[PDB]
Amino acid sequence: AQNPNCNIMIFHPTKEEFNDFDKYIAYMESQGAHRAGLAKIIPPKEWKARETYDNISEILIATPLQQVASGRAGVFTQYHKKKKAMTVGEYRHLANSKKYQTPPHQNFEDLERKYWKNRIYNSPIYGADISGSLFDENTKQWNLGHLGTIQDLLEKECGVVIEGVNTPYLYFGMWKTTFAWHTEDMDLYSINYLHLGEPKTWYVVPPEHGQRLERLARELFPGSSRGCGAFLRHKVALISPTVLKENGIPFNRITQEAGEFMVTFPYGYHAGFNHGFNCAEAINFATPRWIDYGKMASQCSCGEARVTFSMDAFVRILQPERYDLWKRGQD
Ligand SMILES: [NH3+]NC(=O)c1ccc(-c2nn[nH]n2)cc1
Ligand SMILES: [Cl-]
Ligand code: NA
Ligand code: NI
Ligand SMILES: [Zn+2]
């Protein structure tokens, strides 16, 4: 069995290997990459996303979100407070202000230590889920706006057309902006390209061990758990690497830098934080190997989670017994 310890693998495709997206995902899996839940892909030197980032300041962040924590430094939830709209140029200036700028630090480990010590005492602002793309239309390899759609994948695997579309999203981050522990909607894959700026640190639990993380989360957030049997679907809970280690939870960590892709695999729980001002682009995708994960994915039906109408067809077709109750939770 490949990659039996479930390490995060890093790949360096050649320009030729970068042509066929789907083929390379399958190749990574043949090497056991999926066992970790996350892989890093470093593009060949010949490749570029777009020519420059000099002209992005006028993009609008219509609803920046302030991420306010409660709890303890290693075990906390966060809620998103809506702020007034601002441009990417305005948000960059805010990220670099004394209030929000990254502190002086020696290396990525020293910054990580500072993050876990101090995150809860600050409330960073970030831009999330902004439909759009920064890949140039002429970039033919690994352009996140031009991957096979999930709806076409289900049609090719299972036989029936469904409604829905599948387009990328942009994210603008600053120091301490935080992504809570989660798997993707319907346990899909995701891919994330860090276009510009400071790094993003990721934590990931192997898919084979995801129920260990779920168990711990129920223990650590007991009121949440009573409320919803899939509360990690709400994407609000943080548990530090120290606490995971204390509890014996298998996990790994890695830092993504500008110009690198990260792929998350079906049912790979992940969380992390941004080092400073940055811009990333991400989208969910499927392969044939996803279909069984999608059939088995937990669902939140308590109301809290709420998602793109595109998830409706996936539930309806893959999970007909659960559909009516899930649909009640979407209202
Ligand atoms: N599936 N979405 C993610 O894994 C994800 C979600 C949000 C963020 C984020 N970056 N700064 N705050 N949150 C980063 C990644
Ligand atoms: Cl700090
Ligand atoms: Na490890
Ligand atoms: Ni994710
Ligand atoms: Zn719920």
DSSP string, 197-256: ES-EEEEEE-GGGHHHHHHHHHHHSHHHHHH-TTGGGG--EEE-HHHHHHTT---EEEEE
Say yes or no: CB of residue 290 within 6 Å of ligand 1.
no
For residues 306 and 327, the answer to whether their CB atoms sit within 8 Å is no
- State which approach was used to obtain the coordinates: X-ray
Say yes or no: CB of residue 285 within 6 Å of ligand 1.
no
* Secondary structure (DSSP) of 157-210: HHS---------EEEEE-TT-EEEEE--GGG-EEEEEEEEES-EEEEEE-GGGH
Burial (Cβ within 10 Å: 0-12, 13-18, ≥19) of residue 90: middle
Which residues 6+ apart lie within 8 Å of 171 measured at CB? 126, 127, 128, 129, 130, 279, 280, 281, 282
Containing structural domain, residue 174? 1-331
We report the CATH number of the domain holding residue 31 as: 2.60.120.650
Burial (Cβ within 10 Å: 0-12, 13-18, ≥19) of residue 222: exposed
Q: Are strands 65-72 and 125-131 parallel, antiparallel or unpaired?
A: antiparallel
Helix axis angle, 320-330 relative to 310-318, nearest 10°? 150
Using the mean position of ligand 4's atoms as its centre, give its distance from the Cα of residue 268 in Å: 9
Resolution to 1 decimal, in Å?
A: 1.3
Residue whose CA lies nearest to ligand 1 atom number 11: 177
Phi/psi of residue 206, nearest 5 degrees: -55, 140
Structural domain count, the chain: 1
Using the mean position of ligand 1's atoms as its centre, give its distance from the Cα of residue 21 in Å: 23
For residues 167 and 131, the answer to whether their CB atoms sit within 8 Å is yes
Nearest ligand by distance to the CA of 121? 2
For residues 258 and 278, the answer to whether their CB atoms sit within 8 Å is yes
104 vs 53, 114, 155, 284, CA distance in Å?
Answer: 25, 10, 51, 35
Taken as a whole, the chain contains a residue count of: 331
- Write out the two tokens for 107: 């290396």
Nearest ligand by distance to the CA of 124? 1
For residues 170 and 133, the answer to whether their CB atoms sit within 8 Å is yes
Positive or negative CA dihedral for 162, 167, 172, 175? Answer: positive
Measuring CA to CA, which residue among 132, 124, 147 is closest to residue 56?
Answer: 132
DSSP 121: G
DSSP 150: H
Whole-angstrom Cα distance, residue 293 to residue 205? 16
Q: Are strands 60-61 and 269-274 parallel, antiparallel or unpaired?
A: unpaired
Q: Which of 83, 122, 171, 255 is the pocket-test mutation for ligand 1 (most atoms within 8 Å of CB)? A: 171
- Write out the two tokens for 96: 């670099």
Say yes or no: CB of residue 190 within 6 Å of ligand 1.
yes
